[PDB]
Amino acid sequence: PQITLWQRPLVTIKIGGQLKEALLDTGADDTVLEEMSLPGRWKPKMIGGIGGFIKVRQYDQILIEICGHKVIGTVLVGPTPTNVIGRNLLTQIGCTLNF
Amino acid sequence: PQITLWQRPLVTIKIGGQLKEALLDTGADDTVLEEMSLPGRWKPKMIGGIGGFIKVRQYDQILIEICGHKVIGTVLVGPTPTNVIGRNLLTQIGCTLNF
Numbered sequence: 770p771q772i773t774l775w776q777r778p779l780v781t782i783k784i785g786g787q788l789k790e791a792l793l794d795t796g797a798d799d800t801v802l803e804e805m806s807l808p809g810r811w812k813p814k815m816i817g818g819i820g821g822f823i824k825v826r827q828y829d830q831i832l833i834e835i836c837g838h839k840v841i842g843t844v845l846v847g848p849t850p851t852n853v854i855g856r857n858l859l860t861q862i863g864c865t866l867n868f
Numbered sequence: 869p870q871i872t873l874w875q876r877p878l879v880t881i882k883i884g885g886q887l888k889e890a891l892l893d894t895g896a897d898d899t900v901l902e903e904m905s906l907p908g909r910w911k912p913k914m915i916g917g918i919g920g921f922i923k924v925r926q927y928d929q930i931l932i933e934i935c936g937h938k939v940i941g942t943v944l945v946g947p948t949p950t951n952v953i954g955r956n957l958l959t960q961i962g963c964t965l966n967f
């Protein structure tokens with residue numbers, strides 16, 4: 770739908786059988802979730818933002834249901850303060866900015 | 869206009885007589901710009917993101933022209949790696965997410 774920015778753009782997502790809330794973030798190249806049990810293989814990675822860099826684990830082809838849409842993509846799991854849905858998934862659900 | 873997320877959502881902004889590029893970021897409560905000479909009074913502040921926290925200076929009622937729209941709001945200036953336009957200004961230009 771259409772979502773204004775008067776409040777944080779938080780949505781419900783389903784990933785790995787669990788329900789979580791996540792921030793739709795146009796300024797994030799990647800999707801990064803707070804520490805969680807995810808199954809499968811992975812490679813370590815380092816990502817950066819305002820404040821510096823953190824080490825996360827990268828899982829590829831993970832199924833996530835964002836609002837009503839299912840998408841498969843990479844999800845980084847590590848010490849982020851909040852779950853953020855980045856552009857790698859936002860393009861999959863057809864998300865656009867408008868003004 | 870309508871902007872997809874296949875690439876970073878970078879726009880041209882004019883602030884303090886200078887031209888700069890900035891990222892439209894729905895996941896940022898605030899607008900934070902790389903170190904720049906801005907005139908006026910300010911209060912120190914600390915902001916956080918993925919990676920930790922940084923110290924910035926806060927200027928209120930600063931005029932910024934984002935794309936074709938003029939807006940007046942708070943702008944944080946400090947050591948951010950890239951200029952980000954946060955929700956405090958995105959609401960001013962009527963920016964919405966859609967999918």
Ligand SMILES: CC(C)(C)OC(=O)N[C@@H](Cc1ccccc1)[C@@H](O)CN[C@@H](Cc1ccccc1)C(=O)N[C@@H](CCC(=O)O)C(=O)N[C@@H](Cc1ccccc1)C(N)=O
Nearest residue numbers: 796797798799816817818819895896897898915916917950
């Ligand atoms: C700007 C500020 C007011 C301090 O708010 C946030 O940081 N907001 C974050 C959400 C949040 C707010 C408050 C509390 C908790 C959580 C989120 O929107 C962050 N958005 C961008 C802001 C930003 C972009 C670029 C530079 C500096 C800052 C970001 O860090 N995005 C990261 C997210 C992690 C990721 O996607 O990997 C990113 O795209 N990083 C890229 C590019 C990069 C590399 C190295 C350094 C900086 C940026 C990357 N591939 O690592």
